[PDB]
Design a protein around this ligand. Sequence first.
Ligand SMILES: [Mg+2]
Ligand SMILES: [Zn+2]
Ligand SMILES: [Zn+2]
Lengths: 84, 107, 1426, 134
Amino acid sequence: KAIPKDQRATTPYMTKYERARILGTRALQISMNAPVFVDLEGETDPLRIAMKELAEKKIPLVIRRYLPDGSFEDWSVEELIVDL
Amino acid sequence: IFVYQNNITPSAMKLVPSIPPATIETFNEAALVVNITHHELVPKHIRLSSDEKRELLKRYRLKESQLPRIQRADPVALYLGLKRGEVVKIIRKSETSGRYASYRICM
Amino acid sequence: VGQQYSSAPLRTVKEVQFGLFSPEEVRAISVAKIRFPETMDETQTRAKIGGLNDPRLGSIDRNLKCQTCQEGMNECPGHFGHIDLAKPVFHVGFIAKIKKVCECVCMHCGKLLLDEHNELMRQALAIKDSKKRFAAIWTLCKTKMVCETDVPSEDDPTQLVSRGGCGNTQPTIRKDGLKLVGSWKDEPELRVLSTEEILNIFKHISVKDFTSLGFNEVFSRPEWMILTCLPVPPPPVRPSISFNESQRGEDDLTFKLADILKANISLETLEHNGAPHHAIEEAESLLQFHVATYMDNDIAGQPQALQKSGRPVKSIRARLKGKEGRIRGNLMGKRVDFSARTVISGDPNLELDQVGVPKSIAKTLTYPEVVTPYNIDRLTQLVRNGPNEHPGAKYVIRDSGDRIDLRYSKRAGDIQLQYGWKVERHIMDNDPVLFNRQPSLHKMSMMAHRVKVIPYSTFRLNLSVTSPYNADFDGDEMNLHVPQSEETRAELSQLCAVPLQIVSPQSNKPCMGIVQDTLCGIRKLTLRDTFIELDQVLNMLYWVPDWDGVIPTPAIIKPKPLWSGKQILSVAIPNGIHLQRFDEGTTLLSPKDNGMLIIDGQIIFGVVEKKTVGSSNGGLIHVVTREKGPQVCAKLFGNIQKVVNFWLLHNGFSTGIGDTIADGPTMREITETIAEAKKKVLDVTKEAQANLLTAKHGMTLRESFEDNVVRFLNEARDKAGRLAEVNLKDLNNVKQMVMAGSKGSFINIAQMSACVGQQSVEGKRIAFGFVDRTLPHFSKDDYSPESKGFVENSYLRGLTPQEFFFHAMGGREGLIDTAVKTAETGYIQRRLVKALEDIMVHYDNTTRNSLGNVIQFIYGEDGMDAAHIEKQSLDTIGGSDAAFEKRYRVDLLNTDHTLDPSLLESGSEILGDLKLQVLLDEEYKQLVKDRKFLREVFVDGEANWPLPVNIRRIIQNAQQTFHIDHTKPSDLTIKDIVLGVKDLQENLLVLRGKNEIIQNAQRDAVTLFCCLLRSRLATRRVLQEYRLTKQAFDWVLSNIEAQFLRSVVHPGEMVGVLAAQSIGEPATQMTLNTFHFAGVASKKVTSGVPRLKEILNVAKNMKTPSLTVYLEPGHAADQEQAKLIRSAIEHTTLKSVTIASEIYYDPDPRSTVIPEDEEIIQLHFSLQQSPWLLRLELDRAAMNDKDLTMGQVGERIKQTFKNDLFVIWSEDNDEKLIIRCRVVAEEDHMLKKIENTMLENITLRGVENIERVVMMKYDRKVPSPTGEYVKEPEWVLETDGVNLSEVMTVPGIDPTRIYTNSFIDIMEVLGIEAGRAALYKEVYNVIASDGSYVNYRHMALLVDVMTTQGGLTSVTRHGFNRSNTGALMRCSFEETVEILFEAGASAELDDCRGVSENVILGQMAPIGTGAFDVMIDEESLVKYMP
Amino acid sequence: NQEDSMIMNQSSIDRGLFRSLFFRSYMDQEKKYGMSITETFEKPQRTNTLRMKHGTYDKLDDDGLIAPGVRVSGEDVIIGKTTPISSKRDASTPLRSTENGIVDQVLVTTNQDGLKFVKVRVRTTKIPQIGDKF
Ligand SMILES: [Mg+2]
Ligand SMILES: [Zn+2]
Ligand SMILES: [Zn+2]
C-alpha cells in the first residue's frame, strides 16, 4: 500500500535473515561481474567483498519489508543498524 | 435477563428475537449459582466500544476475521452478553512478561 | 531450466484457482480426436496411429514431432486429447456430492427446496463459507421430500403465497455401487436414477441456486461433476518403457483408458444397431466402472478391477496418496543432485565448524563458479588441472549454454576461459556445506560446515558436535548437500553454521558440550595435585594456535620451576572472561577445590569438569558465546581440546576389572547389608501370613505388602552400593570418569561391584506365570525375594540361572515399549510440525500464520528469542517483609536507615535532604508495588525464571573490569542511580509503534523484566552490595540496553516449525505405557505418550478423567470437614449400601413370617396393599464411611415412587438395618422391575459419574503473616469421574481453585481462556515428567494454535487440517486426493502464502530470508562513486 | 578411539590382520522361444543395433565369458550375450559399477530345457580400512 519514510514502525535493526540475504544477494551480483563501490584491498571473494561493501555501508540496496496486511516499509542498508 | 428454574417451553423461547432493537437473554439458576469469572484460571475479559475496536484493527492492520475468536455461547461471552461482532480484551498473567494483552472477536 | 530461451515473460504463481472441466473446454484444449484404443502398429508398422497416444499428442522415439511443436521428448509437456463418452457418467469421487445435491433439489423443475420464506433457511443462506453454508442447507433439505407449491408468507398463516410449481414428491436416495436409487411412497417405487437425467436436472439448477450451494458460476458448476468428455492425459503422464526395439512396455493408465475406450465403443455401437433396450444398461455400467475405476481403485464397492496376473491397478489417485507418492513423495521431499553420504568418525584435530570430506567426494561434487577477473587465473588453473588431480574441475560452460566435458573434449588442455562463463569445479577446502544426520527433527540436525578435503573415505567431524547430530561412530552414515549459488552458500554461512547453533532455543541453553577424553581429561589436568614441567609446558603452549607466544611465569619457581594444569589450560581461555561458581563447601579458598573462579580468562581456583565446561547454562561456553561472539567460542573448543587431548595422550587413561573390585570387607559388609534386608522382608512376610498387616491407605493388603518388600530391597541396593561408591579410592578410573562426568553414574558402580537389583515387569516384581510361582525350580506360593526376581550378585560375581532369566524378562521390556512407542511417536512429531508450519513472527512483531490470523500478538508474549534467556532469580519475591526492608530500604532521614557516608561520596551531605527522599521513596513504593504484582503471578512463590539479559553476570564483569575496590566510597549521585535506571527501561523497547495501543502493549512485554531490573538496580543494592562507580554503573546500563535489544526476536524466525520440532523432539524420547503406580490399582492415572496422544487428539473418553477439588477458605486442616464433603460428592447409590434383596411371601401386613423383623412392624402401626414382600438388609459399615441414616435412605425410596408403594424400616439402633415394602394381575413380575429401578436409578448422596473420591494432604506454600513463604498444608479431594458443572456448585469447595485434568470440560464450564490455561497446563506436565524442559513459548504457541479458533481444534486430519487454509497446504497431509477433489469442486482459490504452497511450486517461500523483498536504489547507486 | 570407534594398529593390518575374502557371482542363461530363436554367448561389436554397453568387452574370450586369471574392475563386461530381434542387441552382464577385483571361477552348464547356463564368480580382497566396522 506504501508507507511514508515517516510513520515508520519496524525494527531499526537488521534481521539476520535480512543481512544474510543482502550479503548473499550482493556477493552473487559481484560475481555476476557487477560494479563494486569499494576499494578491494585485495579481496577476491564476492562474499568477502560484499561483507566489506557492507561494513562501509556502501551497498545500493533497499529492503522492502512487507506487512501482513500488504503494505510495506522500505529500509536502506545505509540506514539499517548492523549490530548482531 | 430472564432466570428460569427447571426449563422453558420450546414454544416460549422462540419469541425473544421478535422485538428489536431490545434484546433478551436466558440463564438457568443452577448456572448462576457460581460466578465462573471468579475462577483461578479465568482472567478478566472486557467489552470494547465500536471505536476502541475500529482502532485495535487499524492499529494492527487486522481484517475482522484474522482476530482470535470467542464462542457466542462462551460462558464469559454470556456473562458479558456479547453480540456477533463485539470484541473482548482478554488481559492475562504471563510467566514470560507479567502481563499480556490479547483479544477475541465474537462469532 | 529446461534449456532454450523463449520470448515468453517469466513470472511466478500467485494464486491457484481450482475449478472443474466443462466438457466444452475439454474439447477446446484437446488436440487428439482419440478414436481407436490401439497404441501403434499401423498394422504392425512401427509408429503411432492417429488413434491413441499421439494422434498429435506428445511422442516417443526421440522425435521432435509433437504437432510441429517439436522441442521433442525433453522440453515438451504432453498435450491433452479428449474422448467423447457415449453416455454421461459419474465422477467416482463426486458421487458423494452429486447425491447430496439431489437430496437438496427436487427433479423435474430442479430448484431449491427452501426459499427465503422458510426461516430456518435464512440463517443458513447467510453463513459465508461455501463449505458449511452447504452441509447446513443440506441438513435442512435431506428431510423435505415434497416440492411445496405454496407456503405461508410473513403475514397470516391463513393466506398462502406461491413460488415455483410442481409438488411431485421428492424421492429419498441411497448409494448402491456407482448408481443412485430413490423411492417414492404406500409400497415404494424403486427405480434407478439415470445419469442422463441427473445431469439434466443439474443443468437446470439456477445461478443463485448454484452459489447458494457450495458452487461457482464460472469455474465449477455442479453439472460438471458428471463427465461428458473425458480428458486424455498425454504420454509424459503414462510413459512407456522400451527394451531397445520391437520390445514395448506401456503404462497401466494407458491400459485403463484402452478398456475405457473399448467399453465406450461397444456401447455406442449398441445404439445404432440391434438395441435390446435394457441389455445396454448392462454395458453402460461397464463404462461407468472403468471411467471410475481409472481415477480411483480403492473403493468400498469391492471389485478391485484387477488386471490379468492379479495386479491391482494404479488409479490416478493412487499416485498422489501420501508418502511414496506425488504430493508427499516427489514434491515435499525430492531425491537431489549434489548430495553425498558415508560412514563418519571423530577427529580431535578439526575445528568445530569443519567437516573432513574425503577427496573421493570432493572430486565428484562440483560447485559451479563464475569466471571472473577475480578468479580467471586460479580458475583456469583448475580447468587445466583436469578432473582427476584434486584441486581441479570437471566441466566448463559458455554463454551459448553448452557443456564442455573436461574429461574428454579434444580441446581439454586448450581452452581460454571467459568473463561470464562458469566452471563446475571440485569442492575445495573451506566451502560451506550442509552436513547432517537422520532422522532430522532438530534445527541442529543440519548445520553448515567448513569443508576440509582429506584422505580415506570417511566424513570427519568434531566430537563436541556429536550430540547436536546425536551420532556415534559405530558405523553411523551421515549425509551432505552442497550449496550451488553464491546467495545459497551465504544462507548456510550466515545462518545454519554450527557455531551459530551453540545455544538451543528449545531449552534456552547450550546444546554442545565437551566429552569423553577431552572432558574426562580436562579434569585430571586441572587438579591442584597436577604439575607440569618445562619441556611439556612448551609443547602445549605451542599447540594453542592463538598463544600470544608468551611463556607464562611458572606457578612455582623455588628449586624446580613448574606450571599447574589449571595454569596452561587457562591459556585456552581468552581474556575478559569472568566466572563465579560455588558448588557445596565453597569458600574463596575451597578446600575440596569445589566450584570455580575464572578471572580475566584465568582459572584462579577450582577443578574443571562437566559443570564448568559442559552444555550447562552458565557454563564456560554459555559465557564466551554471549560475551565474545559465536566465532571466538567455536575456536575455544579447539584449543581446550587440543591442549587437553595432548596432555591426556601423555598422562594416559584406562579402565579395567580392577576398577570393579572393592575392599574385601566392604564386600561382606554388603553381603550382610543384603541379608539384613532379607529378614526385614521375611518379618513382613509372616507378619502378613499371620494377618497382622495394616491394610494402609495403600489399598489391598497384598498390594500393601509388596510396596513394603520392594521398598525394602531397593533401599538395600542403592545403599549396598553407597558403600562401594565411597570405598573406591580417588584413583579408580570408573569413579574418575564419573567425577569428571564424562561417562557413568554411581548406579553403574553399584550394579557392577555391589549388587544388581530387583527386576520388574509393569512394576509388579516377577509374576507367577508358573501357577503360583516363578520357575519350576521353586515351591508353590513362595513370595520370598529370590523368586519374585531379586538379583543379589554384583555384575562382577555374575547372576544365577534364575537371576539371569528374570533379569532378562526385565530388560527385554524397554526394547519393546520402544518398538511400539516408535510407531506412534513419529506420527505425533509430524502432526505438530505440519500444524505450525506457516507460523512465523511477522514484521509488526505479531505471530501469525499463512492466513493473517494472530496467534500471539508477541512471540512468547514477550518478543524474546529463546536463544537469549536463562534462570535468573527475582530477589524481590522470596524473603520476609523483614529482610526485604533491610535491603532495598533507604531513608535519608534517620541515623539508622541512611546510607553510611562510607559508601556514597555525597553521603553525609545527604542525610536529611527532603527533595531526595521523594525519589528515594518513589523507588521503594515501587519495588513494593512490584513484590505484590509478582506474588499475584508466581503464586507458587517460585523466584527463578527464564529471562533475557543475564544481569547477575553483566555486573560481575562491571566489577573486575574497572578493578573496583571495596574500600573507597562511590561517587554516584543518588539522583544518578534512580533517575538513570528509570531512563534505562525507557529504552528496552520491544515494540515500536507511534500510537497508544501499541506503546501500551510495550510496557507489558517489558514488565516482568524491569521488575528484575529494579530488583537489581536498587539504590541500596547498587552501593552497599556491589560498589559500582558512575563509570561502572553507566556501563552496566549500556550493556543491558543492548544485550536486551539483541535478545529480541528477529522478524522472520519460522517459530511455528521451531515450536513444533521442540515438542516432538522430546515427544519422541518419551517412555511408553509405563505406569509406576501399577501395584496400587485404583490409584491408576494416565501418564506418558498415550496421554499426549489423548491431548493433541482432543479425545472425549480419556482413560483417567479425575478432577481435584480444594475446600473453602478457612475449612482446611479440618480433617473431619473432609469426609463431610467427600460423602457430599462421591456418588452413592442404594446398590452400594445394600447387602441383599429378598422377595418374601408375607400376606399379613400386621406380622412378618420373619422373626428378626417383628419389633419393627409393631412400631409402624401404633403411630388395600399387596402380599408380596421385598426385604432389603443394608450394611452398617457402609452407612458411616459415607454418612447416612435409615430415615434418609428409605425417605428417599419413598419420594422416589411416592404414593403407590408402602415402605417401612428399622431404627439406627437395630443390630440389623432393613427395609420392607409391598406393591399396591401379576405382582411378582412388576415387583422385580422395581427390584432394579431400586438399585441403579436410585441416588442417595452425591453427584452422578463421580465414583470413588479421596482425601489428600497437599503441601501448599503461602504468605506467612511475617512475609516469608511457608508450607501451610491443606486437605483435598481428588475425584475419579467428572462432572464439573455440578461438583462446582457444592458448598464447602472453593469453586475458584477447582480443576479437572479434563481441560475439555474446564473449557465448557469455566470458559475457553481458562480452557487454554488447562490445556497448556496439561501439556506442560506430560512433557515435564521426563524432566524435559521446553521454553514456554513453544508449547505456548501450540496451545494458542489449538484454542484461538473457538474452542479445541485438534492437531489431526479431523481438525486444523480443515481450516480456512488453502488447498495444497492441507493437500499435503493425510487426505490428499480427497481434499483436492472437494477443492476444484467448490472453486477454491489458493493464496500460495503457505510454505507448502510454495515448496510445491518450487518458488521462494516467505520465510526468514524470504520474509521480504530487496531492491536497488538507483539514487543511492549514484552517490556511491568518487 | 573416542565414542565407539577404535585405533587399529596398521602394522599388524599389514601382517595380515583381519583380511577378508569376498566372492560375488553373476549368472545368466540363453532364453529360448518355442518358435526357434535363441540368445547366444558371443563377443559382438556394432553391426546394426549399436545397443551395447560402455564397458570394455576386450576382456572376453570367444565363448562370451572371461577366464579366471583375468582382472576385472569398473563396468567391464563379464558375460557376452546376444538376442536375435526382428539383430545385435546386447544382453551381456557388467561387473557391478562399484566393485572391482579378479574373476575366480566360471562354469557353463546345461539347464533342463537344454539351455546354456553360466555362473561367473569374481573374487576380491578387502583389508581393514578406516571406515570399516568391528
Ligand atoms: Mg544408533
Ligand atoms: Zn509438444
Ligand atoms: Zn419442483
